[PDB]
Amino acid sequence: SHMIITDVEVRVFRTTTRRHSDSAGHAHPGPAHQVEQAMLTVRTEDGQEGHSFTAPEIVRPHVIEKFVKKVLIGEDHRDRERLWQDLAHWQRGSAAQLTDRTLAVVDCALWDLAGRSLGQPVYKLIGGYRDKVLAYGSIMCGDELEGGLATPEDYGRFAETLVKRGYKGIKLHTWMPPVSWAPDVKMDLKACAAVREAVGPDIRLMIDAFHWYSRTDALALGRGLEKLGFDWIEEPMDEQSLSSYKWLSDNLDIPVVGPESAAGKHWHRAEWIKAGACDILRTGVNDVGGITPALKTMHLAEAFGMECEVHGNTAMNLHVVAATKNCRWYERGLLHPFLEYDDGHDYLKSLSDPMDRDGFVHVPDRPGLGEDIDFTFIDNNRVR
């Protein structure tokens, strides 16, 4: 019974960061400050542990006591599919509180536990495809910070810095409310043009614009991007409208990648394929409720001969990318000229996603998700 789960624990601690979020949830660089971060730990009878990180609300006591502990405690930790399905079945009746984000952090901690228990990196446990992968530099949403990302030229200058670092692909997130004047298609296209001019024709370029443009605006944006040879347009319209995406994909030559934020996990993503609503599928550990359903999405896409680009940085996403073939990139970011991404997090002793000078991220040969957790730091900076 050494494999039986005995504890589900949450530790909230302060991390020091310059990352802030605006009222709509977009990240920007700001003053250094302390932000509450949560670590979920699952422990088995033999004392083995697995861990994963998320925002405190996602693993708050209401959710832990009412849902997570009831499913997990006393169960064989290796039954990840049964445990995931148990949580999935409880979402409908959860009064909107058992979210995909909660499923995701639980699933990740269980994968980390299995990997740590076996001394195996998660992607090797899944069945490895690649030990390294090209990353694209994923640039923060636009701002109104002088010399930051305030002008099209600012994007161009930052792109030059990213190319020098070794990135072979770059994705712009352009300007969104509450940026005072945003959004504006012509401005977004000017940023895209400045980047293409700055980096030349052989660096791959992508854009993730304001996520709720009208059909007419997204059409204008996409048509403008085709002149610049961009690789994809990402979430330019409200993803709750599958029909809008079929229409836009049919009208644009440039590949449309999606859905990123839409709910419904792998099930709903099958509908995007069935309806021809995108040319490249999207998934993400946080978007579909864990590594387990993210793998399902990757396989779904591959069966249709499609790529499925994995949304988000950090180990959990990197291991999905490393275990699968049909994905061009790991998403490395968000990035901003005021910040050095390689500084990492104060609660991790080393990067989960180090990138060489040629633009390849190498998956750390460390057990589980391979997050090099500074447990002492976390204990010294505990909130609750």
Add this chain to the structure above:
Amino acid sequence: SHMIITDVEVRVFRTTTRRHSDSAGHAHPGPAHQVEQAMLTVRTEDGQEGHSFTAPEIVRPHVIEKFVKKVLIGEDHRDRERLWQDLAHWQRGSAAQLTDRTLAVVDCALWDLAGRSLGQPVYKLIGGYRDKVLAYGSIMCGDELEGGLATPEDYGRFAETLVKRGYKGIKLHTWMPPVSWAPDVKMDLKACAAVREAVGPDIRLMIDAFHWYSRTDALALGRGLEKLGFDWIEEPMDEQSLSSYKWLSDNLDIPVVGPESAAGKHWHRAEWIKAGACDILRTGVNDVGGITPALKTMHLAEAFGMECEVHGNTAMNLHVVAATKNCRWYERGLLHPFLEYDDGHDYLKSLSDPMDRDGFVHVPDRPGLGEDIDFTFIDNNRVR
């Protein structure tokens, strides 16, 4: 480098069996005789091994030397996805010799190797869903053996025996060439009716008839089955005709399950979903080239809210069934009144798929595929 593959070995040995195959490849009971069986073994630097069984031609020296050793020797055995994709890429140029059956046994041996190395059952390594599952009793193709499966009544009598054993589902394979008079739709329906009459309304019934009936014959067969409340009709037409299956499914109320034998792995099975060619998907370790692509097919199906019924007995298929939710049964057979399935194989010390008196097969808690191999027997009965 303990995880690096050092050897790929094939041992051909004689198994004593009463199973014979007719000219079309359908199994029937016959005289006890010795049949050549092959075991593929993959070994790593640390001496750990994984094994899987197949027919000798599938792992003959041509295939092993030209394809398998070149991909595997010197590689990290845990990179199952990379190694599978490497073999898949070589199939096109293999002059038709590198078959899905060869990919399957290799993938299975690699899974067994990982599981044995880690002391973990394969389904637990994948991420467990269930430790037991209902089995249906899968009856051999019809014959002309008196008291065997020669008449509709013979199927009825055998079905009574299967129900007493504990099976909660039964699948008939009916009469096929070279049975002298076969095939005949009315005879197949009479067997189906005899079984329904024998077992009553609460045992689930399925039929896998002659695999190449015309559209008109398959339609008559399916319409006849609806009167008997059968759960599915399986491969009644040439599966190379996807369009015939769309037509048949649209015409029948009874669920059509497929494709079983069609090539193209998970890629082609996506086409069966896209075209609405079946109501229930089918996969199988031997049919799609391994546990790895079988899992992909299961996930593909689940994303569409469909079931995917796993073709074939033995550990390799049982572990797929145990790791996934969207499958009603493990297929236990082929079965015949002249044979006791629970006798098992002379080269295995115990059953990989023991079934209780309530009809549940319990996955053995043994590492890897959990095949209880009698290595001594194999050594004593070696051919080459």
